[PDB]
Amino acid sequence: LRIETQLLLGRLLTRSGDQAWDFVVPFALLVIFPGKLQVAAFYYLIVKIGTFLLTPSSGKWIDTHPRIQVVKWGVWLQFFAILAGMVFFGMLDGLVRAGGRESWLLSVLFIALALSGVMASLGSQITDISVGNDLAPSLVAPEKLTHFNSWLRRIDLATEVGAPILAGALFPLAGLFLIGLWNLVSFVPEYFLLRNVIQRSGLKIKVLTEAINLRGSFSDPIFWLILSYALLWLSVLSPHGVLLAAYLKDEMRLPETEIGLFRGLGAVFGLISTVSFPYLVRRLGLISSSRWHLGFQGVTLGIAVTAFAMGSTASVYVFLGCILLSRVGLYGFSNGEFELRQRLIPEGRRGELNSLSSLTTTSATLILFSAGSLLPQTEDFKYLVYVSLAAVLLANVVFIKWSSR
């Protein structure tokens, strides 16, 4: 295998395990604390807030250590976080099965679980930045990055579609530990693949920074590109969106069978961007392809939101169809912004400025989570819809302004 293929193979193996694990954790939480959806929510919250708080530090840590150290800590932090998580899950499940109720002990084990979730999430973010935003632009010719990124996207979508299937086959909570085990094992090929390409090549030579402040990050021009991407995470208009599903079910009275297919079609339209975006790049260049895809997301969601406004079931399939089309735009733009970060971010600032990107997208996630919790009613879904559209149009404005560079 050539270098580029080794990178993709490593990503494919470790992701299939990551996606399988992320899929089953909420269900495992619900098995242990039956009914209590607030507990699963609390888990997710701690992980995200935790990752948020550790992000600037981790980006400085990335720029000040050799790559082989970054990859070692990135992967093995995950490995041992997942192992710790499995141990705490087992303990929790054992405790509750044996009749344990609310206690400091049970609480302490939940916190230990949630913190291990923070470590894994942070390790994963470090590894993504390292492989996708440092190793890849250092190993792959600039003109072949678009091709390389489209395969990274295909791996992400494929393992995303394969996750419920994998999990299904393997699934009290015995399925969880089998998924945990597969996840553990799936970290190992990527560690050694990465370690061996670093050991044998010029990745060893890298000037490190000695030895937060975020003023330097936010003041950099690339932050506006970063903001144009992050804004897209604010939307409730997604195939997987829980508030949209709730809305479609109660207000639109769509059958649950049609809602599930809609949800499942997300991946397909994501996959379509991996053909449309590279095609436009090769024809119009990276900036122009990005602008067209982002505009396509803006137009299709504009149409979808007009169809939502005249709130008839006579317009519901155009609403859903346009949301699905918009995913082509979103997934295309996401590869473009990713590639612009690969190409434009100085080598010595790869940890810093890409962690800024993680910081801003995690913030968007937290806001979206906050809005979901604050406006949980289907009759209020209307307001989240208009703010989602506004965010997308603002993203277009910000990117157009930025791409005047």
Ligand X SMILES: CCCCCCCC/C=C\CCCCCCCC(=O)OC[C@H](O)CO
The residue among 29 and 345 lying less far from ligand X, judged by its C-beta, is: 29
Residue 14 site contact among ligand X, K ion, none (CB < 5 to 8 Å, cut-off depends on kind): K ion
Residue 171: DSSP 8-state: -
Taking CB under 6 A as the criterion, the residue among 45, 112, 188, 214 binding ligand X is: 188
* HSE value, Cβ hemisphere, 13 Å, CA-based, for 34: 3
Distance CA 50, CA 275 (A): 36
| Residue 253 Cα distances to 231, 284, 341, angstroms | 30, 43, 43
The residue among 17 and 278 lying less far from K ion, judged by its C-beta, is: 17
**Is residue 11 within 8 Å of 186, Cβ to Cβ?**
no
CB of 51 to ligand X, least distance (A): 18
Residue 375 site contact among K ion, ligand X, none (CB < 5 to 8 Å, cut-off depends on kind): none
Q: Is 148 in the site for K ion (CB under 5 A)?
A: no
Q: List binders of ligand X among 104-123 (CB under 6 A).
A: 106-107, 110-111
Q: List binders of K ion among 11-70 (CB under 5 A).
A: 14, 17-18
| Residue 53 Cα distances to 82, 141, 213, 301, 363, angstroms | 20, 34, 13, 33, 10
* HSE value, Cβ hemisphere, 13 Å, CA-based, for 145: 24
The residue among 106 and 178 lying less far from ligand X, judged by its C-beta, is: 106
Whether residue 18 is annotated as binding a ligand: the answer is: yes
**Is residue 230 within 8 Å of 366, Cβ to Cβ?**
no
The residue among 259 and 345 lying less far from ligand X, judged by its C-beta, is: 259
Q: The tokens 């919250």 sit on which residue?
A: 45
Q: Is 258 in the site for ligand X (CB under 6 A)?
A: yes
Q: What would the x/- binding string for ligand X be over residues 283 to 302, using CB under 6 A? A: -x--xx--xxx-xx--xx--
Distance CA 163, CA 230 (A): 25
347 Cβ partners below 8 Å, 6+ apart? 134, 138, 206, 207
Whether residue 183 is annotated as binding a ligand: the answer is: yes
Residue at 212: amino acid letter? I
CB of 194 to ligand X, least distance (A): 9
Q: Is 4 in the site for ligand X (CB under 6 A)?
A: no
Taking CB under 6 A as the criterion, the residue among 61, 80, 151, 223 binding ligand X is: 80
**Is residue 69 within 8 Å of 351, Cβ to Cβ?**
no
Q: Is 33 in the site for ligand X (CB under 6 A)?
A: yes
**Is residue 5 within 8 Å of 19, Cβ to Cβ?**
no
Distance CA 120, CA 27 (A): 18
Distance CA 178, CA 174 (A): 6
**Is residue 404 within 8 Å of 228, Cβ to Cβ?**
no
**Is residue 339 within 8 Å of 32, Cβ to Cβ?**
no
Residue 220 CB coordination number (10 Å): 17
Residue 186 site contact among ligand X, K ion, none (CB < 5 to 8 Å, cut-off depends on kind): K ion
The residue among 5 and 57 lying less far from ligand X, judged by its C-beta, is: 5
Residue showing the smallest CB distance to K ion in the complex: 17
If binding means CB under 6 A, how many residues of this protein chain bind ligand X?
Answer: 48
Residue showing the smallest CB distance to ligand X in the complex: 94
CB of 180 to ligand X, least distance (A): 12
Closest CA to 115 of 180, 53, 185, 194: 53
Whether residue 190 is annotated as binding a ligand: the answer is: yes
Taking CB under 6 A as the criterion, the residue among 40, 95, 393, 394 binding ligand X is: 95
The residue among 129 and 259 lying less far from K ion, judged by its C-beta, is: 129
- Residues of each annotated binding site for Ca(2+): 18, 78, 183, 190
Residues that bind ligand X (CB under 6 A): 1, 6, 33, 36, 39, 80, 83-84, 87, 91, 94-95, 97-98, 102, 106-107, 110-111, 188-189, 193, 195-196, 258, 261-262, 265, 272, 276, 284, 287-288, 291-293, 295-296, 299-300, 317-318, 320-322, 324-325, 328
- Residues of each annotated binding site: 18, 78, 183, 190
